Design a binder for these strands. Structure first.
Lengths: 45, 114, 119, 122, 177
RNA sequence: UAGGCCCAGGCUCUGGGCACUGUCUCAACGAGAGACUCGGUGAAAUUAUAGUACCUGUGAAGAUGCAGGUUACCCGCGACAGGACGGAAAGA
RNA sequence: CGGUCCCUAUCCGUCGCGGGCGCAGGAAAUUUGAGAGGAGCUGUCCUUAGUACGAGAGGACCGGGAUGGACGCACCGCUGGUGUACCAGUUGUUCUGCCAAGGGCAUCGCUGGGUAGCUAUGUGCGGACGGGAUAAGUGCUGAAAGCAUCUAAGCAUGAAGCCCCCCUCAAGAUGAGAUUUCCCAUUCCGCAAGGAAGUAAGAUCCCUGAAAGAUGAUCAGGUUGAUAGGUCUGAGGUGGAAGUGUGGCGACACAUGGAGCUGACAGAUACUAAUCGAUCGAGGACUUAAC
């Protein structure tokens, strides 16, 4: 259970390809123009 | 599950007395051993009444020659001619597993009559 | 089935009792999304008990509601409020006395927050 | 579910009061046995004036078991202890009387000789 | 070869004439309709495509409505296909009711077993690596039909059958025979 | 919370019998902590470079990297413990 | 010259599950099967038959017919197991001002039962019936060697070998297959090549969830709707609630009364929550031949 060798840059970058975030689901508030998460609340919107 | 009830309604029996775990029954089960259709009678104490519907089953316990015997039957079996209740027993429970270890006086305490 | 909410069998019961009493008192509560989702059922069952009004239902409710003060002006218990104020308000509804509105993530731990209120 | 080392009562006049199974006769991998089977037994307690002594290796048939036997009609039957009847060569008993009730499964095997001597077969 | 599609409902019991108790499984099968028949000269093999359990028009898309238009029925939720059947005696748009079978016939039943999730090696391949279990197609052969109810469209099959409740089940005549 | 009994000999040892049991035939379910997903924070041993399949041979020790063949779309997540020229070991 | 062990183990490998792109328009379903894996087992009894055979004693081969066992696959209708938000009894102490009734803690305090789900020790089913080419062998016919000869040429038979029949996976089978149905060929720049923008059929984000599940995934639904909770009515479980009345000096008993209570199960019911929205997604290359 000991790393036999260091990890190259290219393999590290390849492994980090699924490690990213998603754009949120946002809708605009009927009254106002604020943006909130869909199915979330904003009467103050 | 109403569908299953309609499916199975025609086999449900109606000539059945009302009995409770703790009562004494005298079942008339049919024996086809040497063909020669014969009635063998069982008499004992109702121990269990689990089930519900066509799957309802009851257990009867007796003592014969010093050995206690359990016989379990389906409620609606056609292998039963008729059931009559000999005695009514007052019991504080629904499953009577405790008296399968009692003997004699301690067990016959159940003979308390309502 | 039902959620365990990260507690043991007794802490879960205690937190549910506390939240039910708090919602009865304040008419509107802010808590996590899953706590509200689990609180909805118990609070509606107790509203159902209060809608009956007899002594048996009153004692069944009392065996679960906390001993707290609804408002100090009239020296009113939470149980008294349940059996006098809310049961009269919801005399025509058949179920569905609550509604959950989702707010968004908390800053401390990213937990999803929600408001649960009586309709 | 009688297994090796299971201690069973003996219910005939043979003189043995109690036995301990050595092995279960039948199949090749069969580990347990039920009502109506034949096993090899070692007598541990015996009466001093019987036909079988303490310690001999004999054969016996299972008559009663707390584990039940289910029948075709959906019914069941169960008893309070495990009982054996001492047997010899063919399916005949080494005793004149059998005490207690025996199962009706002893009938579908060809054991009528011991069935007829039972005070009541259920 | 003859078959029909339905869905499982549950298990129960049936006391027969001898008085014996027989575990049974209930399959509800409303009229199944032939949606297409593949010919050897056109498809390379011979089969009939069965449709079952129509659904709400919103739940269906336009290609599905078009495919079923020739048989003149509402779109069907489940569609399977049977090989080895007599290519005649079936027509596009006709109905295969639960009466193709009779009491006493021997049948095969195919379904998908209940999922079990990530199970261990001990429970998966009794000690051969651990992994996801269940949720695979299974066939139980030589099952006996107990009773056929035409009005409620029911088949009663002796024994057990793979699958959870209200899942799809195929009932074909026995292959081994 | 808090000792299993009885019959023995030898002064504690060897016994024997009983009771009792998941020790096992043979495991099943349930509870909690970790594992797993999300938000915050955030190390260490190790490390010639590396786009690092398998088989049969060859070969200064045992081939991923030599020859001949056979297989294989690109990138991950969770497991296993097969190789691990991992460490333990120890014979010697 | 064997043993161990210990990560979980970075790396290769093995198992399971996803994301991307490809498969000359864009989609939704149903499939063929190059290829791969699995299956392959036993014990008694009845018969032939007391038969052939065997001085007697003894005693078959083959073929059928039952009944078990082990193993494998499914499932909870039955017998059980568990079932920590179900029902009940009970000890100590403490609390809701008191009585009565209840709550907290003591391994879920302990004890008796038990719904759903998951389960085996429980139940159902399987390993069958057959076909094809053979190896070793046993053979027919026949030359060398005018004969004979398993063989040289030619024809048979032939085994728990093998291939099909049974079960499962399988078109990343880059050789990327087949069938049915739907949408149509829009607007801008760029002569051409080509590139952008709205869309069509269709999906996804998001949300309600479980027959699914580590997470993705899969499946049922999203206000012409029963997806989940609640309510109402039921199913099963426990088992005779509170209050009041009566009998008793009292612990308690009886009646009101199969009563009260009831998590995961069924049917009705839009009462509460699935609002509004946003994103993606074609315009079909060339050659030849038959038309």
């Amino acid at each position: 259970a000991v790393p036999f060798r260091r990890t190259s840059k290219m393999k590290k970058r390849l492994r980090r390809t699924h490690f990213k975030l998603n754009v949120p689901g946002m809708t605009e508030c009927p009254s106002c123009g604020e943006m909130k998460l869909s199915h979330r609340v904003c009467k103050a919107c | 599950q109403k569908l299953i009830e309609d499916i199975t309604k025609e086999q449900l029996r109606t000539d059945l007395p009302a009995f409770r775990p703790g009562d004494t029954l005298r079942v008339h089960v049919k024996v086809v051993e040497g063909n020669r259709e014969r009635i063998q009678i069982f008499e004992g104490v109702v121990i269990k009444r689990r089930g519900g519907g066509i799957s309802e089953t009851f257990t009867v316990r007796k003592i014969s020659y010093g050995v206690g015997v359990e016989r379990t039957f389906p409620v609606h079996t056609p292998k039963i001619a008729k059931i009559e209740v000999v005695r009514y027993g007052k019991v504080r429970r629904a499953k009577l597993y405790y008296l399968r270890e009692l003997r004699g006086k301690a067990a016959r305490i159940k003979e308390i009559r309502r | 089935s039902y959620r365990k909410l990260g507690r043991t069998s007794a802490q879960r019961k205690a937190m549910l009792r506390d939240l039910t009493t708090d919602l009865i008192i304040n008419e509107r509560i802010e808590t996590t999304e899953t706590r509200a989702k689990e609180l909805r059922s118990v609070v509606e069952k107790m509203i159902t008990l209060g809608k009956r009004g007899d002594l048996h239902a009153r004692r069944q409710a009392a065996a679960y509601i906390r001993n707290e003060v609804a408002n100090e002006e009239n020296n009113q218990d939470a149980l008294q409020k349940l059996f006098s104020d809310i049961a009269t308000r919801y005399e025509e509804r058949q179920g569905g006395y609550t509604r959950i509105m989702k707010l968004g993530p908390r800053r401390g731990d990213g937990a999803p927050m929600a408001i649960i209120e009586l309709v | 579910m009688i297994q090796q080392e299971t201690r069973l009562k003996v219910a005939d006049n043979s003189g043995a009061r109690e036995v301990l199974t050595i092995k279960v006769l039948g199949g090749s991998g069969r580990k347990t046995a039920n009502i109506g089977d034949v096993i090899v037994c070692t007598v541990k307690q015996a009466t001093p004036g019987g036909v079988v002594k303490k310690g001999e290796v004999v054969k016996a048939v299972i008559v009663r078991t707390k584990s039940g036997a289910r029948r075709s009609d959906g019914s069941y039957i169960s008893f309070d202890e495990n009982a054996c009847v001492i047997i010899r060569d063919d399916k005949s008993p080494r005793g004149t009387r059998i005490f207690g009730p025996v199962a009706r499964e002893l009938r579908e095997n060809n054991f009528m000789k011991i069935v007829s001597l039972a005070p009541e077969v259920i | 070869t003859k078959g029909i599609l339905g869905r499982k409902i549950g298990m129960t019991q049936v006391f027969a004439e001898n008085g014996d108790l027989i575990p049974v499984t209930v399959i509800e099968a409303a009229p199944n309709v032939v949606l297409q028949k593949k010919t050897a000269e056109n498809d390379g093999y011979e089969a009939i495509q069965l449709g079952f359990d129509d659904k709400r028009e919103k739940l269906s898309n336009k290609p599905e409505k078009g495919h079923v238009a020739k048989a003149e029925t509402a779109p069907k939720r489940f569609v399977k296909e049977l090989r080895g059947v007599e290519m005649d005696a079936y027509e596009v748009g006709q109905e295969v009711k639960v009466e193709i079978f009779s009491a006493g016939e021997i049948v095969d039943v195919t379904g998908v077993s209940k999922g079990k999730g990530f199970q261990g090696a001990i429970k998966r391949h009794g000690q051969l690596l651990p992994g996801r279990m269940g949720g695979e197609q299974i066939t139980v052969q030589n099952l006996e039909i107990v009773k056929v109810d035409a009005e409620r469209n029911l088949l009663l099959i002796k024994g057990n059958v793979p699958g959870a409740k209200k899942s799809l089940i195929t009932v074909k005549s026995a292959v081994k025979s």
